[PDB]
Assembly symmetry: C2
Homo-oligomer: 344 residues x 2
C-alpha cells in the first residue's frame, strides 16, 4: 500500500537512561529532542503503523525524553507514548491486519516508534478503535490518563473509605479521578502549589484543596486527616510533601506512588507507623496493572470510551504543530491547567 | 490465697511517649527505671497474677522504657513484656482460674504490670502453660522472639524465594530465623557491624554475612543481590542501611519493617522502584499478626513449645538479679551475642 517512505518526527537525542537527572520540569526540548526527517518504520507481525492525527504530552513523556522514566530511550527514535490516528498498515497477524483503516487511540509502549511523528508504531493490542461518532480530540488522550484514573479509582473504591488523598491535584489525571469520585460520593483531598487552582478543583468535586506552600500546611493537613480519615494516598510527587502527607494519615494508610515529580529525598518520617499503624507503601504502574488484570482491561477500555461517547468525559490548553513543538512545547507546558497536544 | 501484698519491681520513670527520643542504645537504666517496693496488683477477670521466675530483656523493652515504642508508658508501673513464672492468682473468668498453679511463659501486653517485678499481670490468653518437662530458661523467652520468628519466616516461605535478607543479623530473633531457614534450605543474607559475628552467623546457617561498616559494602551488596535475588527483607534497623539494601534488591522486593534500631532518616532512594520494579514497603507487628491470624496463633505456639520440648530450640549471656538490674543491665546489653535476663 501507498504510504510515505519519509516523515517528520521529534527524535530522541538521549540514549538509555540519564546519568545527570534534572527533575520533572521541562525547561527546553533541544537537549532531549531534535526535529528530523527519517524513514517511516515498518510494523512487525503484531503491530500497526498509524498515521498520527494528534499526540498527547503526558508527564511520562517528559520523564522519558529526559531519560528519567522506567523505560530506556532509543536514540534517534521519535518519542511520544500516545495519540490518535488512522492505521495505514499492519503486520501479517490477523489482529493487526483487521485494524487497517481504523481510526484508533493508541499507546506506543515499547515499540520505540513514538507518537511525536507523522507515523507511529503500536501493538495491535495497544489500540482502541474509536466508535465512528467519537471525537478525534477525545481519542488522543483516551488511554493513559483515563485508564489510570479508572484503575486507581478502583483501588479507592475497594478500600471503601470515602476520603482519599492525591498530590499534584491540578494534573489532568487527578481531575479525571476527582470527577469519578464526585459521581460515587467519594471525597478527594488534593494538594496544589497555586491558590488560583483551589476554586477549579473544588468545582469539579474535590472536598479539600490544600496549598502545600501555605505556612500552616502541616497543621491544616493534620486537621483534615483527623476529620476525613482517608486510607488511600495516590502520589505523583513523592519527596517531602508526600512524606508529610503519609506521616499525617491514619492507621492502615496506603501510600501508592505512581509518579516522581519531586526528585528531593522521599523520607519515611516514622517507620514505626508501618509497624504499629499497619501503613503500607507501594507503586502503581498502568502497564503492570494491564498485565496483571487482563480481565479488567476490557471493561476499563469499554468504560473509558463509553464515557467519551456518552458525554460523561470530554478532554486542552494548546495544539502545537509538530514544526513548532521543539521551540514552544516548554512554554505551553508551564501554563497551569489543560493538556498540550502535538499535531503532526 | 496467701500472696505477698508488697513486691520489688523496676518502675517506669517516664509516662506516655518521649518528647526527646534518643535512639536504641541503652546507655543507663536510671533515666527510665527506678527500683522500688510497690503493692502487688490484683488481676482483672480475664487476667492472671504471675510470680515471676525469670524475665527477658528484648529490644522492644528498651524502646518501651525510653517512650520510643508503639505502646505508652504508665509511670510507676513495672516494665518488662515477657517472662516465665507460676500463676498464683487469677480473675474470676474460668480461663484465668484454670491456669492457677501452672508454670507459664507469659506476655504482659497492655496489662501495665510488667515482668520486671516479683509479680506480673498477663491476660490468661497471653500465657503458655509449659510442658512439665520444659526448662524454665526456655520459658522466659518462649514468646516474643520464637513466635515472631515463626510468623516472619512463614512470610519468607510463602514468597518461595530461597534467599532473603535481614538487618541486625546477630540479634536473637535473626538467629532463630537463620536456624529455621537452614532446616528448610533457605539462604539468609544478613548484615552485622562486627567482623567477629561473621563466623557465628555462618555457623548457624547464614548464606551471606555482610559487615555494613566495610568500605565496599554497597558494591558487595549489589553482587550478593544479583547472585541470590531475594524478595523478602526483614528489617529491624531502618535508616540508611535499610535504604541501601532495599535499593539494591531485585524486582518485587518487600521491605518488611519490624524494628527501628537506627533513628537516622529512612529514605526511599528510588521511589521509581516501587512503580517499575513492583517493590513494597510494609510493617510487621507480632501483636497484630496474632490478632489477624488467630487460626495460626495456636499452631505457632504448639510449634514453638514442641521445638523447645524436643531439643530443636534451646535459649543467654547473663542472668541479672533484679536488685542489680538498674545498675548493670546496660553493661550486659553492650556484650555482643546472647540474651540478658532479670531474676526477681
Ligand atoms: K545514557
Ligand atoms: K511523656
Amino acid at each position: 500500500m501507498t504510504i510515505p517512505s519519509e516523515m517528520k518526527a521529534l527524535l530522541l537525542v538521549g540514549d538509555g537512561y540519564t546519568k545527570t537527572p534534572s527533575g520533572s520540569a521541562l525547561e527546553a526540548m533541544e537537549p532531549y529532542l531534535e526535529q528530523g526527517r527519517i524513514a517511516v518504520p515498518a510494523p512487525g507481525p503484531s503491530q500497526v503503523l498509524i498515521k498520527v492525527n494528534l499526540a498527547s504530552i503526558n508527564p511520562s513523556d517528559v520523564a522519558f525524553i529526559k531519560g528519567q522514566y522506567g523505560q530506556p530511550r532509543v536514540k534517534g527514535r521519535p518519542a511520544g507514548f500516545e495519540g490518535v490516528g488512522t492505521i495505514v498498515a499492519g503486520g501479517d497477524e490477523p489482529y493487526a491486519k483487521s485494524l487497517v483503516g481504523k481510526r484508533v487511540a493508541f499507546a506506543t509502549g515499547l515499540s520505540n516508534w513514538g507518537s511525536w511523528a507523522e507515523y507511529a508504531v503500536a501493538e495491535a493490542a495497544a489500540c482502541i478503535p474509536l466508535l465512528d461518532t467519537v471525537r478525534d480530540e477525545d481519542g488522543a488522550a483516551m488511554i493513559v490518563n483515563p485508564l489510570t484514573a479508572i484503575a486507581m479509582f478502583d483501588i479507592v473504591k475497594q478500600e471503601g473509605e470515602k476520603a482519599f488523598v492525591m498530590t499534584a491535584g491540578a494534573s489532568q489525571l487527578c481531575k479525571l479521578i476527582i470527577g469519578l469520585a464526585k459521581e460515587e460520593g467519594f471525597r478527594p483531598i488534593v494538594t496544589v502549589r497555586r491558590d488560583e487552582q483551589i476554586a477549579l478543583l473544588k468545582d469539579i468535586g474535590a472536598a479539600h484543596v490544600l496549598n502545600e506552600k501555605a505556612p500552616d500546611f502541616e497543621a491544616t493537613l493534620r486537621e483534615v486527616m483527623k476529620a476525613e480519615q482517608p486510607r488511600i494516598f495516590l502520589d505523583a510527587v513523592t519527596g517531602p510533601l508526600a512524606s508529610a502527607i503519609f506521616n499525617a494519615m491514619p492507621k492502615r494508610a496506603r501510600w501508592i506512588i505512581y509518579g516522581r515529580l519531586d526528585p528531593d529525598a522521599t523520607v519515611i518520617r516514622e517507620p514505626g507507623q508501618l509497624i504499629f499503624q499497619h501503613k503500607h507503601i507501594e507503586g502503581f504502574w498502568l502497564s503492570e496493572w494491564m498485565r496483571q488484570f487482563k480481565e479488567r482491561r476490557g471493561p476499563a477500555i469499554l468504560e473509558a470510551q463509553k464515557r467519551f461517547s456518552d458525554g460523561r468525559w470530554s478532554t486542552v490548553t494548546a495544539v502545537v504543530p509538530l514544526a513548532e513543538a521543539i521551540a514552544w512545547v516548554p512554554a505551553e507546558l508551564t501554563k497551569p491547567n489543560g493538556k498540550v497536544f502535538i499535531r503532526p
